[PDB]
Each structure stands twice: as structure tokens, then as C-alpha cells.
């Protein structure tokens, strides 16, 4: 019935304040369609390490995407994508930051890079994972390919590379469409 | 284009009141932080206090607080200043800037063109 | 409060030199500096941020350096468009506090 899903956004030194701003502005609009609606929700920014910016609680309380994000601060280091999502894991999935026990696990994963460390995400794995790769880093096969491993399968679904920060945008449309 | 046009400058007496106005265009006024910031006939810039629109959350520098009120009307896209308790050394050109809160604290990329406040008797 | 002192307060040079501002703090604040550019009768412009980030829009002419207490602006190749103060600012603590300004004028 209801979702908790959590935000894990890039916050590397590839970003531009206005790419990083877009991407802040997605989650924002996705929140605010996903609103009057059984879906609570939190943030998390990762680069070398990593900040929940809000949690679940934080959510059912303020209920204002803008209020909630409004202290974020540009990371601008790395892109740890691996120990983000075991993060994430073990972390913010917890009712201590206000995480509901029968709520099925969301993860939107926004990057423009490709993760900069290894291992394995295992203890993500009930956890529903979307990814989204943002332009010109992807802008090869190869490397979009590189996603195929945190993203849930089949790929075909959970993955999406988009060609320009603009186009987020193009994307948030396309949800509105959809059921 | 991102836009702030500012309203409510003129001549105020001492111990007089005065609210100033910053119309915000062309981008989401609720997503950033806004500020305000004044300067005195041939001087320097100094920084009021900032606002976040959202939930109205402040921040002032402290040789303003008491006289100075900031606040925000979401509804209008709307940034105001509220003087108070006036005096000669008030006489700036009042500009509302909006800020980057990204980096460190906040720098300004954006502002408004400004208006000039007068106290005299 | 952190004291920004900006040198010279003035200064004069002809078309195409290298013109270099020196902001100074009153203790540390990292890297996080900011330039304005303040035209007459206008709001000032941002040029720089985070010590050498040079803004969208701003000409490759205009460049920060400096870590710490020490800053520089660099214009180099000074344009007659170039005429206009140019403060600096600290964004690393608050309250926000800029420089005193420094005019720019055009030898010709």
C-alpha cells in the first residue's frame, strides 16, 4: 500500500550549481505530485561520503520539498555509488529515522558519473532500485552499462540515462503520465 | 529571465517605519534564499539578514535585528523589509539579492536594482 | 565578525594591463571568496566564487586566486568596459561581510 522511498542524489565535483540545482528541483516535483498520497520520503546527497539531507520523519512533518532541502550543500568530491546505496541500506531504512516496517523500499538514484569505488550493494537487495544517469558522462554505451549493477532488474525498466540535466524535465512529465 | 524589482524607497523621517518590497520573476521563489543588502551614499556593501521563503526561516546580521524585519509573502512572490525606529546613518540604497547557499554560506548571483531610502526630517 | 580589506582603494591603469586586486581576511575562510563587479547607478555583478569560480557569463579576463586570508582578482587585459568597484566577499561564516571596495579607472 504505501512506500518509503529515499532520494539518493549525486553531489560530486562534475556538477555545475545549476545541474545540481536540477537535479534538486526533480526531486521536488516529484515529491510534490507524490503528495495527499501514502508515500513519505528522504534525502540523501553522496560524493565521498555521505548526508541525509532529510529523513522520513522529517517528511510527515514538514511535508514542504523546498523547506526540507533548503540547507543542502553542494558535496563537490567524488561519486561513491557503492558505499551510497549500502548506506542507504543500513542507514536511513531504519523506523529510528521514521521508516514504516510494511512499507515496500524505493530507492531514485540520480548520478552523472560513474561510482568511483567498489564492492557490492547485497544488503540493498530488497530494496526497489531506479537509477538515472545524467549526460555526457554516459553518453557511451559502456558506461551506461555500468549502471545495469545497482539499478533493479531487468534493466530495460529500472534504468534510464538521460541526455541533458534539462531533460529531467522531459522526465518528470513522463511520470505524470503513468500509473 | 530571473527578475527582482524592488518598490517602497523614498523619504522617511526619523523614528519614522518604512517597508520596502522585492518582486521576484522568471524562477521558483520559493527554491532559493533570499537577501537583503544596503549601501550608503559613496560606501560599501553590508548585509541585512536573508530569508528562505518556504517556511520564512531567517537569518539576520545581528546590528540589524532589532529594527530590521525580514519577511516573505509566497502568494505574491513577494520579499519585504521592514525598517523601523529610522535615523540619518539609515540613508543606503537597499538592494534584495537572491543567494547561493551551495558553497560555504551564501554569495549573491542575483539582484535587484535597487532603491534609495531617505531619512531626513 | 571576519574584517575584508580590499587594496588599493583606487587605482588607474591604461587598456590592456593586468590589473590585480587583492582581497585580505581577518582570520581563515577557506576558499570561499566572492567578487563583485558594481557599475555606476547599478547593483554589483557577481565575477567570482569559491576563491577562483569564475560565474556563467563573465568574461575568461576576470580571475580569482587565493586560499585562506589571502585573495587576488585578476583582470587581465583590462577593457574600457571594465570601469566599475569591485568588491569582494566572504562566504564562509556569518554575518556576510564584503571588502570596502576598489575603484577601477580607465588611463587612456
Known amino acids: 500500500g504505501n512506500v518509503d522511498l529515499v532520494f539518493l542524489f549525486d553531489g560530486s565535483m562534475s556538477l555545475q550549481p545549476d545541474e545540481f540545482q536540477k537535479i534538486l528541483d526533480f526531486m521536488k516535483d516529484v515529491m510534490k505530485k507524490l503528495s495527499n498520497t501514502s508515500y513519505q520520503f528522504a534525502a540523501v546527497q553522496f560524493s565521498t561520503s555521505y548526508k541525509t539531507e532529510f529523513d522520513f520523519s522529517d517528511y510527515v512533518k514538514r511535508k514542504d520539498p523546498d523547506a526540507l532541502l533548503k540547507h543542502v550543500k553542494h558535496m563537490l568530491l567524488l561519486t561513491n555509488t557503492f558505499g551510497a546505496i549500502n548506506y542507504v541500506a543500513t542507514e536511513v531504512f531504519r523506523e529510528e529515522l521514521g521508516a514504516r516496517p510494511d512499507a515496500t523500499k524505493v530507492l531514485i538514484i540520480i548520478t552523472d558519473g560513474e561510482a568511483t569505488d567498489s564492492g557490492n550493494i547485497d544488503a540493498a537487495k530488497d530494496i526497489i532500485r531506479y537509477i538515472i544517469g545524467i549526460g555526457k558522462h554516459f553518453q557511451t554505451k559502456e558506461s551506461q552499462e555500468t549502471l545495469h549493477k545497482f539499478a533493479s532488474k531487468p534493466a530495460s525498466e529500472f534504468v534510464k540515462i538521460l541526455d541533458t540535466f534539462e531533460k529531467l524535465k522531459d522526465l518528470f512529465t513522463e511520470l505524470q503520465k503513468k500509473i | 529571465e530571473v527578475q527582482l524589482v524592488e518598490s517602497g524607497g523614498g523619504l522617511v523621517q526619523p523614528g519614522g517605519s518604512l517597508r520596502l518590497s522585492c518582486a521576484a520573476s522568471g524562477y521558483s521563489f520559493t527554491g532559493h534564499w533570499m537577501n537583503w543588502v544596503r549601501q550608503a551614499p559613496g560606501k560599501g556593501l553590508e548585509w541585512v539578514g536573508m530569508?528562505?521563503?518556504?517556511?520564512?526561516?531567517?537569518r539576520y546580521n545581528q546590528k540589524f535585528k532589532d529594527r530590521f524585519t525580514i519577511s516573505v509573502d509566497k502568494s505574491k512572490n513577494t520579499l519585504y523589509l521592514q525598517m523601523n525606529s529610522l535615523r540619518a546613518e539609515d540613508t543606503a540604497v537597499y538592494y534584495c539579492?537572491?543567494?547561493?547557499?551551495?558553497?560555504?554560506?551564501?554569495?549573491?548571483?542575483?539582484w535587484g536594482q535597487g532603491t534609495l531610502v531617505t531619512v531626513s526630517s | 565578525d571576519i574584517q575584508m580589506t580590499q587594496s588599493p582603494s583606487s587605482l588607474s591603469a591604461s587598456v590592456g594591463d593586468r590589473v590585480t586586486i587583492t582581497c585580505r581576511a581577518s582570520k581563515t575562510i577557506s576558499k570561499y571568496l566572492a567578487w563583485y563587479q558594481q557599475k555606476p547607478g547599478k547593483a554589483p555583478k557577481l565575477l567570482i566564487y569559491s576563491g577562483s569560480t569564475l560565474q556563467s557569463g563573465v568574461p575568461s579576463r576576470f580571475s580569482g586566486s587565493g586560499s585562506g586570508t589571502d585573495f587576488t582578482l585578476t583582470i587581465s587585459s583590462l577593457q574600457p568596459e571594465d570601469f566599475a568597484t569591485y568588491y569582494c566577499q566572504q562566504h564562509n561564516e556569518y554575518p556576510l561581510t564584503f571588502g570596502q571596495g576598489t575603484k577601477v579607472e580607465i588611463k587612456r
Open positions: 530569508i528562505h521563503p518556504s517556511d520564512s526561516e531567517t
Open positions: 539579492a537572491r543567494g547561493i547557499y551551495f558553497y560555504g554560506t551564501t554569495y549573491f548571483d542575483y
